[PDB]
Each structure stands twice: as structure tokens, then as C-alpha cells.
């Protein structure tokens, strides 16, 4: 009975991909933020 439930939930959770689990594909803005920081670092630095 529990196994049948697990599959059903796994079916829903894959269809919608709501939850940050097996059927999830985490993205990353870290690298864009880092490049954002580098741009900030060097704008203020411009000009001697």
C-alpha cells in the first residue's frame, strides 16, 4: 500500500517538479552574481 502511494506521489512530484528533490533541477545565479560583483568592483575602480 505504501509503495503504491510512493509511486503516485512520485508521479505528481515529477509532473509539477514542485519540490527540491529527485525530480528537481536546481539552477544557479551565483555565477551571474559573482560577475555582477566583478562589474561593481571595477566600475568604482575606473580612472587614475
Amino acid at each position: 500500500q505504501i509503495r503504491l502511494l510512493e509511486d503516485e506521489v512520485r508521479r505528481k512530484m515529477s509532473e509539477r517538479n514542485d519540490y527540491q528533490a529527485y525530480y528537481y533541477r536546481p539552477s544557479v545565479a551565483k555565477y551571474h552574481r559573482i560577475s555582477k560583483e566583478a562589474a561593481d568592483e571595477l566600475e568604482a575602480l575606473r580612472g587614475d
Binding site: I34, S35, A38, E41, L42, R46
Partner: protein, 167 residues
């Protein structure tokens, strides 16, 4: 006009490229192609910096290998055919007159040369390569250059491993 004429010259030389079979004739064809492509990318760029760069690496040094090892010569020189030249001239001209006909603007790229940027742009009033090549050296995107140089080092370790077959 220069841009589409330059397309036309590249098209004609490309037709030359696919016909020629003598290795020098092909290698010669690449040489012209490289000047043309350098010109063309330069036009649509912010400046010609990259054009000068890839010229001296690709053409200036690296096509020397291709011509040199393709100095096999076929054991004999070219039998040049004035016919493909005349067709080359013929195809060039009516492509060129069409270039005179084609829509002046819409037949042009849309990229933003330094001039085709707006006046207000405070960034554009710096040295043309300063802001473009900035992050090739500034962290955290500069280590990849370190990978390039070591890649080239390793490339030499490879060449001496392949080019050293018992002689």
C-alpha cells in the same frame, strides 16, 4: 558598398576554394579568405583589435605550417585556367552591380560599432579595448587564461611526443 562587396568577394573565393585541388592553390585560397574575414569581422566589431590579433596568429604564423607542409608542390607548378578567373570576374561583377542595387541599409548588419553607439553612453569614451578585455585578467574569469597557457604548454609536450617517432 564595402560590406556586401566583401560578402561577394568571400562568396567568389569560396567557389574558388571548392574547385581548386592543388594544395598550394587551396592554401593560397585560405590566405585570401583570412584577409577577407578579418576585414569583415572588423567592420561589425567595436574596433579592429581582434582582427589584428587573429590575423597574426591564424594567418601570420599558423598558415605557415599549412603552406610549408603542403609544399609537396605536386612535383609541378600550377596550370592556371583563365576561365575560372573569368567566371570569377563575371560572377563578381553582377553580384557587385546587385550590391549597388540591394537595399542600402537593410542589407547591412545591425551590430553596434563604436560609432553606432549612442552619444550619451559614458562607457564608450574609454580606450576601445580597455572595457572589452577587462575580465580576461580580472578575477574570477582570468584563471581560464592560465588554463590556456598550460594547454599550450601541454600542446608542446604532445607535439614532441608525436613528432618524435624514432626521428
Amino acid at each position: 558598398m564595402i560590406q556586401l562587396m566583401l560578402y561577394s568577394l568571400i562568396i567568389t573565393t569560396s567557389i574558388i576554394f571548392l574547385n581548386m585541388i592543388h594544395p598550394l592553390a587551396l592554401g593560397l585560397t585560405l590566405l585570401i579568405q583570412t584577409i577577407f574575414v578579418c576585414l569583415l569581422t572588423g567592420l561589425m566589431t567595436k574596433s579592429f583589435w581582434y582582427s589584428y590579433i587573429l590575423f597574426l596568429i591564424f594567418l601570420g604564423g599558423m598558415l605557415v605550417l599549412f603552406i610549408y607542409v603542403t609544399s609537396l608542390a605536386s612535383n609541378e607548378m600550377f596550370n592556371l585556367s583563365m576561365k575560372l578567373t573569368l567566371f570569377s570576374s563575371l560572377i563578381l561583377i553582377f553580384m557587385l552591380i546587385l550590391s549597388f542595387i540591394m537595399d542600402k541599409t537593410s542589407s547591412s548588419l545591425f551590430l553596434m560599432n563604436n560609432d553606432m553607439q549612442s552619444i550619451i553612453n559614458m562607457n564608450s569614451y574609454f580606450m576601445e579595448n580597455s572595457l572589452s578585455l577587462n575580465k580576461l585578467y580580472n578575477f574570477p574569469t582570468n584563471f581560464i587564461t592560465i588554463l590556456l597557457m598550460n594547454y599550450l604548454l601541454i600542446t608542446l609536450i604532445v607535439i614532441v611526443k608525436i613528432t618524435k617517432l624514432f626521428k
